[PDB]
Design a protein around this ligand. Structure first.
Ligand SMILES: Nc1ncnc2c1ncn2[C@@H]1O[C@H](CSCC[C@H](N)C(=O)O)[C@@H](O)[C@H]1O
Ligand SMILES: Ic1ccc2c(c1)CNCC2
Length: 261
């Protein structure tokens, strides 16, 4: 019944707690922002994660997870359980009034990528390759998509801070991973980002209860769902980024491959 709590979920409050200074201050490489974008950039740069279609699970109201990604997939599908978020994304996609400012992220994605690309061009490419923003439920065996417009099976998947924050225990987590794994074409690629050993986090009036997992549980979960863990790293949250919006211990990045056998 996490969904009950997600009802009071305030996108703007979420964005302010996680993507605005101090966490959203991308000057200083020892930060989470830099590190997350770095993991993403380095993985795609290997040019092994490629194709035509891509799906972002539980996008929430953020876009940074697709910045380096868009350069490799012409058809990008963003998703999220809450409508308030799907709406929040739209303000940025359609450049509506009061959309969130991802300038800094776009810029650092461009710095890290080193293609001499300007942020305006990248944001333009992301907004372009994002075809639709569909509603999704990782808890359903067929992720809120009975006959979804999304091209299936996707050639790759990306998820940042979703699963751990939607499931109440390690088992839900595992099943949710299985669910989404079904959307991934065999031999496909998965880029998983999430909170390590986190139990709760605020988002306005909402107070989400989440499953504290470990780099090892996640790895196992990945292997159990039928993946070849290509890369798995962990960033330890510094004291300075430990504000009172949650109790994260660290953050993990996972590059997994749907092993086709
Ligand atoms: N059952 C469910 N299935 C999929 N997404 C869900 C869900 N229940 C809640 N969510 C959404 O999953 C998100 C997790 S937190 C936001 C994650 C975002 N990718 C980021 O990095 O900031 C929230 O936006 C929440 O509304
Ligand atoms: I750093 C970072 C980014 C996103 C989120 C958290 C921490 C903690 N709560 C889930 C959302």
């Amino acid at each position: 019944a996490v969904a009950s709590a997600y009802q009071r979920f305030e996108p703007r409050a979420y964005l302010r707690n996680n993507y605005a200074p101090p966490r959203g201050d991308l000057c200083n490489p020892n930060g989470v922002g830099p590190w997350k974008l770095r993991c993403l950039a380095q993985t795609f740069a290997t040019g092994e994660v490629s194709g035509r279609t891509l799906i972002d699970i539980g996008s929430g109201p953020t876009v940074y997870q697709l910045l380096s990604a868009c350069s490799h997939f012409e058809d990008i599908t963003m998703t999220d359980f809450l409508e308030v978020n799907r709406q929040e994304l739209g303000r940025w996609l359609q450049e509506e009034p009061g959309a969130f400012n991802w300038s800094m992220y776009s810029q650092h994605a461009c710095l890290i990528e080193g293609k001499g690309e300007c942020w305006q061009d990248k944001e333009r490419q992301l907004r372009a390759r994002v075809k639709r923003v569909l509603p999704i439920d990782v808890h359903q065996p067929q992720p809120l998509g009975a006959g979804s417009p999304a091209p299936l099976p996707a050639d790759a998947l990306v998820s940042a801070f979703c699963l751990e924050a939607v499931s109440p225990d390690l088992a839900s987590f595992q099943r949710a991973l299985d669910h989404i794994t079904t959307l991934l074409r065999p031999g496909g690629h998965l880029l998983l980002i999430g909170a390590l050993e986190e139990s709760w986090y605020l988002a306005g009036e909402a107070r989400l209860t989440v499953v504290p997992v470990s780099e090892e549980e996640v790895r196992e979960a990945l292997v159990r769902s039928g993946y070849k863990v290509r890369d798995l790293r962990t960033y330890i949250m510094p004291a300075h980024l430990q504000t009172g919006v949650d109790d994260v211990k660290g953050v993990f990045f996972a590059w997994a491959q749907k092993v086709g056998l």
